[PDB]
């Protein structure tokens, strides 16, 4: 089983400065690149960082970089990221994920208080019933081919990799769940809706860098 | 800018022998593999043989194991295919084609006239449509593929192209237009607006083990 | 744990027959490399036979060879396979199956074939060596045309499988001491063991891996 | 023909910018890795700063980190180097290099005036037509065989000479030869031919930073 294990969080003041940590295993770490990706409070999800699998070259956000540095100790299958210069703004709960773009596992989460480019759409906000079919739309500023990722997040739990590519299906995740779509235009259909499938879904880009994600569409009753 | 130029056709007797060869060029020839697949006349594409980066490893169908011998020479950046003991089920045409299960980009293709396991069901056989209306192809496997699926299209005389690869990723240059969908026995291709250069016969390839075999073939044509 | 390569299906048939040699692989991930099963003649060098690559599509064959011998591998049951059809008093010897398709790192214990009625030149100069312990010995290695880089040199004691020394020419290969040294490039290599010591009395080969086939050396025999 | 173009040095003063482009030609520029590697006036070469095959992954020194950016544009084939709040010790004649570890191919280099460690032995040697030289360098830590073999004539920019230690180049006479492993290497010149009369460095590439030798001048 893939395991990747968080911890390292908590609370500064502004300016401080802050070591998440991150322990895999269940796969061969060297041979897959990393990631951090952050979720403030009730806002959607952001990519932070990026790390390769020899762990030379490395990708931040503008709103981190300068101030945030993602490491990786392979000797000991570990991630880091030093979080430098904190600011309000940064207080979210964060993940480390495998690979570059493309999620399949994702970490706990571990919370961050601080206290004293192409544009991805979705519909934000719909109400729905049990046994309903219900079709999200994600769009993107600019052609992506099948270059779309669907994750699901429950409140305060870890998002999960349910759809890769514009319509292939994640190992476990039952086939009521259909992507279609290509270049600017992608679906995500629930079809009939059905017992926990009431969370927030995002889309997310994995073409260029930083990789992107929707605003997120809660579906609720 | 990328070419494969085929000679070595012609008409020869049966248990008579021939040799193809493909001359590439716009890629690194000896940085991919390359395979020969061939077309009964009126048939549909049948793999016929692939050739690993170096030239070393081979692989053949059962039809022509033991009697067709693939080559290559990467110093000159050629492709060979030699035929011996030529059958009259041989008479095709022959085309070259880059990488081994995954044919980007093909050749013209060469007669051969000889005179003197994984099935995919493609279905239907045969549809007539007009312009601007929707069609779905279906193609079926014996056993679960994954995504290792292939959508080609083929006008009349022309060598194949690569439209869908991994079922759903779409090729450059293929208009949106064209959706792939399906996994593991179940797949579609989906043409939305049917265009007036849309009228064609296109195939589904498997792509995960060997032999890479076709589907039937279906023909969308206007009436 | 470690790499092991276990053999099995050999014996004796008669000409014209067909026997099956099996290879069970584990300790490492089998369908990420290739495979190859190399023979040994009764009193000649090694001879590589056939070769698998990581998916088992395409596969290679060598002319003495070609057209009665099949490869094949099972990457669900991490197995290598051989099919010798139309067996000739030639084939008579000890097979090997070895991981990797030019650079053999890993060997299998090999199988004995008896069948009994009831291309790059590469020349090694040494065929026979008697010297006494703690003795400096240069084994000499000489190919037809240039090969750059692509040399291997392995050990072998007489009814066991070889054993990977050298690989790319002059880098050592982990376990090997540091008493064995490559040199060499293009048409001309040497593998000196500096101090000779006991265990190193045995049967050296060199092996090109530019090419296909995959030629051996003659072999030199240490020997006191 | 491999062309790496370089342009847009001069001279700057301290606490100034400057913007470095490389037009790259002749090759996939989207499918390969590409890095900056200066040399200080009469010092030795020190790698810079790698970006990844796309515009995303960067890497650099610690002495360049928060002042200088690298990035590229494939649709240009161009490579960028912005090197801002520069300092007095940035003063160098700057390279691009194809891949990030072992650069086959180098550029003109271009003059930016602001006005594991590797060791080499010996500094500078001198010999005559068609001696022997032996040049060894060593390693704080073992490197497997994760070593290259560069050398550079005077006011041209170097040429890679060994790959892995041991692996010759193509085009490089056979007389160089590459030895070594871990902690201890060797390169070994045999007959000394006029052209080989240059600087001779050592890299390692198998770890960040990627960390160049002093440096052997053969002279004379």
């Known amino acids: 089983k893939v395991q990747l294990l968080e911890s390292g969080g908590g609370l500064v003041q502004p300016g401080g400065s802050l070591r998440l940590s991150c322990?895999?295993?269940?796969?061969?770490?060297?041979?897959?690149?990393?990631?951090?990706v952050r979720q403030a409070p009730g806002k959607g999800l952001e990519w932070?960082?990026?790390?390769?699998?020899?762990?030379?070259?490395?990708?931040?956000?503008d709103s981190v970089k300068g101030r945030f540095t993602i490491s990786r100790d392979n000797s000991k299958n570990t991630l880091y990221l030093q979080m430098n210069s904190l600011r309000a703004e940064d207080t979210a709960v964060?993940?480390?994920?495998?690979?570059?773009?493309?999620?399949?596992?994702?970490?706990?989460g571990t919370l961050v208080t601080v206290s004293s480019i192409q544009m991805t759409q979705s519909p934000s906000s719909l109400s729905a019933s049990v046994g309903d079919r219900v079709t999200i739309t994600c769009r993107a500023s600019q052609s992506i081919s099948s270059y779309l990722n669907w994750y699901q997040q429950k409140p305060g739990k870890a998002p999960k990799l349910l759809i890769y590519s514009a319509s292939r299906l994640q190992s476990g995740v039952p086939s009521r769940f259909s992507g279609s779509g290509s270049g600017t235009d992608f679906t995500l259909t629930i079809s009939s809706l059905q017992p926990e499938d009431f969370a927030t879904y995002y889309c997310q880009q994995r073409y260029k860098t930083p990789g992107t994600f929707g605003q997120g569409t809660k579906v609720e009753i | 800018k990328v070419q494969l130029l085929e000679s070595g056709g012609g008409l020869v007797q049966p248990g008579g022998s021939l040799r193809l060869s493909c001359?590439?060029?716009?890629?690194?020839?000896?940085?991919?593999?390359?395979?020969?697949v061939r077309q009964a006349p009126g048939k549909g594409l049948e793999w016929?043989?692939?050739?690993?980066?170096?030239?070393?490893?081979?692989?053949?169908?059962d039809s022509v194991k033991g009697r067709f011998t693939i080559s290559r020479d990467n110093s000159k950046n050629t492709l060979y295919l030699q035929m011996n003991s030529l059958r009259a089920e041989d008479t095709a045409v022959?085309?070259?084609?880059?990488?081994?299960?995954?044919?980007?980009?093909?050749?013209?293709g060469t007669l051969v006239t000889v005179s003197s396991d994984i099935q995919m069901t493609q279905s239907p056989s045969s549809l007539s449509a007009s312009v601007g209306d929707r069609v779905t192809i279906t193609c079926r496997a014996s056993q679960s593929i994954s995504s290792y699926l292939n959508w080609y299209q083929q006008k009349p005389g022309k060598a194949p192209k690569l439209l869908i690869y991994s079922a759903s990723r779409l090729q450059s240059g293929v208009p949106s237009r064209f959706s792939g969908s399906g996994s593991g026995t179940d797949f579609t291709l989906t043409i939305s607006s049917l265009q007036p250069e849309d009228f064609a016969t296109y195939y589904c390839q498997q792509r995960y083990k060997t032999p890479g075999t076709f589907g039937q073939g279906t023909k969308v044509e206007i009436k | 744990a470690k790499v092991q390569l276990l053999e099995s299906g050999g014996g004796l048939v008669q000409p014209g027959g067909s026997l099956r040699l099996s290879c069970?692989?584990?300790?490492?991930?089998?369908?990420?490399?290739?495979?190859?099963?190399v023979r040994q003649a009764p009193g000649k060098g090694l001879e590589w036979?056939?070769?698998?690559?990581?998916?088992?599509?395409?596969?290679?064959?060598?002319d003495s060879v070609k057209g009665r011998f099949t490869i094949s591998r099972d990457n669900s049951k991490n197995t290598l396979y051989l099919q010798m059809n139309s067996l000739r008093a030639e084939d008579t010897a000890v097979?090997?199956?070895?991981?990797?398709?030019?650079?053999?790192?890993?060997?299998?214990?090999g199988t004995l074939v008896t069948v009994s009625s009831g291309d790059i030149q590469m020349t090694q100069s040494p065929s026979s060596l008697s010297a006494s312990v703690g003795d400096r010995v240069t084994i000499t290695c000489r190919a037809s045309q240039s090969i750059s880089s692509y040399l291997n040199w392995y050990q072998q004691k007489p009814g066991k499988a070889p054993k990977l020394l050298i690989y790319s020419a002059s880098r050592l290969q982990s376990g090997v001491p540091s008493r064995f040294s490559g040199s060499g490039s293009g048409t001309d290599f040497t593998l000196t063991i500096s101090s000779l010591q006991p265990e190193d009395f045995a049967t050296y080969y060199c092996q090109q891996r530019y090419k296909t086939p995959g030629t051996f050396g003659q072999g030199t025999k240490v020997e006191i | 023909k491999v062309q790496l173009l370089e342009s847009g040095g001069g001279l700057v003063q301290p606490g100034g910018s400057l913007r470095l482009s490389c037009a790259a030609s002749?090759?996939?520029?989207?499918?390969?890795?590409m890095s900056w590697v200066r040399q200080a006036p009469g010092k030795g070469l020190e790698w810079v700063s790698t970006?990844?095959?796309?515009?995303?992954?960067?890497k650099y020194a610690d002495s360049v980190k928060g002042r200088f950016t690298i990035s590229r544009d494939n649709s240009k084939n161009t490579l960028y180097l912005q090197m801002n709040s520069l300092r007095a010790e940035d003063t160098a004649v700057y390279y691009c290099?194809?891949?990030?570890?072992?650069?086959?191919?180098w550029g003109q280099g271009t003059l930016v005036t602001v006005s594991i460690q590797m060791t080499q032995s010996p500094s500078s040697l001198s010999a005559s037509v068609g001696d022997r030289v032996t040049i060894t360098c060593r390693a704080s830590q073992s490197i497997s065989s994760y070593l290259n073999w560069y050398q550079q004539k005077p006011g041209k920019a170097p040429k890679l000479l060994i790959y892995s230690a041991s692996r010759l180049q193509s085009g490089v006479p056979s007389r160089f030869s590459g030895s070594g492993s871990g902690t201890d290497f060797t390169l070994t010149i045999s007959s000394l031919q006029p052209e080989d009369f240059a600087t001779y460095y050592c890299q390692q590439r198998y770890k960040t930073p990627g960390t160049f030798g002093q440096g052997t001048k053969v002279e004379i």
């Open positions: 002749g090759f996939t520029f989207s499918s390969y890795a």
């Open positions: 290099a194809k891949k990030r570890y072992p650069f086959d191919y």
């Open positions: 970006i990844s095959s796309q515009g995303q992954a960067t």
